[PDB]
Amino acid sequence: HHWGYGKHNGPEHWHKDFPIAKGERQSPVDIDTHTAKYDPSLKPLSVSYDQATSLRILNNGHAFNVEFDDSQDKAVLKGGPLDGTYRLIQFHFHWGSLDGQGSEHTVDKKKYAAELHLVHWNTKYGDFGKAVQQPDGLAVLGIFLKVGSAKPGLQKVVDVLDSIKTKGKSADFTNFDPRGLLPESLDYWTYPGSLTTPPLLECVTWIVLKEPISVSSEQVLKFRKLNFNGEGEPEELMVDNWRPAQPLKNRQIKASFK
């Protein structure tokens, strides 16, 4: 009876196995745009993905991950609110059963159809596993998805999903360029938070872009054909794999823009 997104193992149950679920810096949150403070000391975000080396795509039973070779100084996030250099290890999405829900962060209570998370670890800690044990271990770049025009740079991901329908399937996915998933603007909100899935570790500097990307209805429909269950188990569609907004408690959200 492990954690998931259902009635009996979903977000409201996670605190039993992972008591940090009720902690002081949990994610996601609602971003109250009028209460976020513009911080003119915040630097432009530096996203340097020119040499990113995607290796593989994995259905892990909760989402799918596009994984990267993080053994060298390639695909890194710097600047913005960050001190030092953070290296890209994986990305994944959270999405809904319907276009009206699916994002984890919300903006003035608005839910987007999905949310992309580009996960990076602080190079001062040597690798991902050590970084997650530190309060400044990770930087997650979050990007909202709305349904409209297709995102051409997403299509390579969409097309491989048929080969990883089920928990534990992976496929070679070399040469995927995550620059094709980025909106025009790198204007952002930032706050200190957590992983949004168990173990819910409070190790993340969140950087949430203001500008959503548009994906087509057909693209997101293909996300919804994935399965939470393993092969030869009863079919439970992989939909609504998002954690709701958590209490802000004693945190300030900062805006890079006026």
Residues that bind Zn ion (CB under 5 A): 117
Asked whether position 88 contacts ligand 9DH by CB under 6 A, the answer is no
Say if CB 63 and CB 93 are below 8 A apart. Answer: yes
Partner whose footprint covers residue 199, from Zn ion, ligand 9DH, none (CB < 5 to 8 Å by kind): ligand 9DH
* 62 classed as catalytic: yes
Catalytic, out of 2, 15, 34, 62: 62
Asked whether position 119 contacts ligand 9DH by CB under 6 A, the answer is yes
Asked whether position 255 contacts ligand 9DH by CB under 6 A, the answer is no
Asked whether position 181 contacts ligand 9DH by CB under 6 A, the answer is no
105 marked as part of a ligand binding site: no
Site string for ligand 9DH, 208-247 (x = CB under 6 A): ----------------------------------------
What is the nearest approach in angstroms of ligand 9DH to the Cβ of residue 173? 17
What is the nearest approach in angstroms of ligand 9DH to the Cβ of residue 6? 18
Nearer to ligand 9DH, 9 or 37 (CB): 9
Contacts within 8 Å (CB) and 24+ apart, 172-177: 172/55, 172/56, 173/54, 173/55, 173/56, 173/57, 173/66, 173/67, 174/53, 174/54, 174/55, 174/56, 175/54, 176/52, 176/54, 176/57, 176/66, 177/49, 177/52, 177/54, 177/153
- Within 120-159, the residues that bind ligand 9DH by CB under 6 A are 132, 140
Asked whether position 205 contacts ligand 9DH by CB under 6 A, the answer is no
Say if CB 60 and CB 197 are below 8 A apart. Answer: no
Locate tokens 């890209």: which residue?
88
Rounded CA-CA distance 228/238 in Å is: 5
1 marked as part of a ligand binding site: no
What is the nearest approach in angstroms of Zn ion to the Cβ of residue 209? 14
Separate counts of helices (H) and strands (E) for the chain: 4, 15
What is the nearest approach in angstroms of ligand 9DH to the Cβ of residue 40? 28
Q: Which residues contact 177 (CB under 8 A, 6 or more apart)?
A: 49, 52, 54, 153
Query: How do strand 86-95 and strand 76-79 relate by DSSP bridges?
Result: antiparallel
Catalytic positions: 62
Detail the residues annotated as belonging to a binding site. 92, 94, 117, 196-197
Which residues lie near ligand 9DH (CB under 6 A)?
Answer: 117, 119, 132, 140, 195-197, 199, 201
Detail the residues annotated as belonging to a binding site for Zn(2+). 92, 94, 117
